[PDB]
Design a protein around this ligand. Structure first.
Ligand SMILES: Nc1ncnc2c1ncn2[C@@H]1O[C@H](CSCC[C@H](N)C(=O)O)[C@@H](O)[C@H]1O
Length: 241
């Protein structure tokens, strides 16, 4: 099941596998939603949250965007596989105005379609010598057909209000994995995350955790020890109460 956008660490192929272990719930909360491969593909209501506000705002905007609108912008900027100057023009325009629609368009032309925002909130991905294709409109339509059940938020997982009755799915940056968004992670964050989880479990709230116990060289240790407290499936693992 497709995510709304390409994303490092997406759960596109693993979703069907994880879903079988999901409990009943009043609301599904995708705490670190990322590219939405999970959010778009589970029964709602869904609360999709991610700390990267620019991306969340982009999703919020797409709610009332048609593929038509996307095309108009692409033509407006005369984007192609070699429009390096127009790409740069579009990038400046987004950095100055922060129009989420522009961010969506930009990503189709950035290197490897990856979104990179620095501390000031500017897009830094270099021109990717590419433009939209077929798979492009597919992910979009999939977004549009499944965004009704979703409410978006852009908060640190700590500030997210957890309600009785919801299932909290968490797929945070892997403390031992290579990825852009790891810049928000730290052993500190993980410690707080696991403590929140122990807390949810105490309220009777179900959660599910995706992560890597030991990928190449390095290994996650506090997790392996902490995971013993719960059930772990080996696919990378899935830890749930
Ligand atoms: N403190 C924090 N609070 C909330 N989200 C955070 C965070 N630090 C990092 N994140 C987010 O956690 C995400 C983990 S990657 C999740 C990918 C998602 N499962 C998918 O299929 O696309 C990153 O995209 C990042 O935006």
């Amino acid at each position: 099941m497709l995510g709304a956008i390409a994303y490092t660490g997406n759960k596109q192929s693993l979703l069907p596998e994880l879903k079988s272990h999901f409990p009943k719930y009043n609301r599904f909360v995708d705490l670190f939603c990322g590219g939405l491969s999970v959010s778009l593909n589970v029964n709602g209501p869904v609360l999709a949250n991610d700390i990267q506000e620019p991306i969340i705002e982009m999703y919020k905007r797409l709610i009332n965007v048609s593929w038509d609108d996307v095309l108009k912008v692409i033509k407006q900027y005369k984007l192609s596989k070699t429009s390096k100057e127009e790409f740069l023009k579009l990038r400046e325009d987004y950095n100055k105005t922060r129009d989420p629609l522009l961010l969506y368009v930009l990503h189709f032309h950035g290197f490897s379609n990856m979104i990179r925002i620095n501390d000031k909130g500017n897009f830094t991905t270099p021109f990717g010598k590419r433009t939209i294709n077929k798979n492009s409109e597919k992910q979009y339509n999939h977004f549009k057909q499944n965004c009704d059940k979703i409410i978006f938020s852009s908060l640190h997982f700590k500030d997210v209000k957890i309600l009785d009755g919801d299932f909290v799915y968490v797929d945070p940056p892997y403390l031992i994995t290579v990825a852009d968004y790891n810049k928000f992670w730290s052993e500190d964050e993980e410690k707080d995350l696991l403590n929140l989880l122990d807390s949810l479990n105490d309220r009777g709230i179900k959660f599910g955790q995706s992560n890597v116990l030991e990928h190449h060289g390095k290994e996650n240790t506090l997790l392996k020890e902490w995971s013993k407290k719960y059930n772990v499936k080996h696919l990378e693992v899935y830890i749930f109460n």
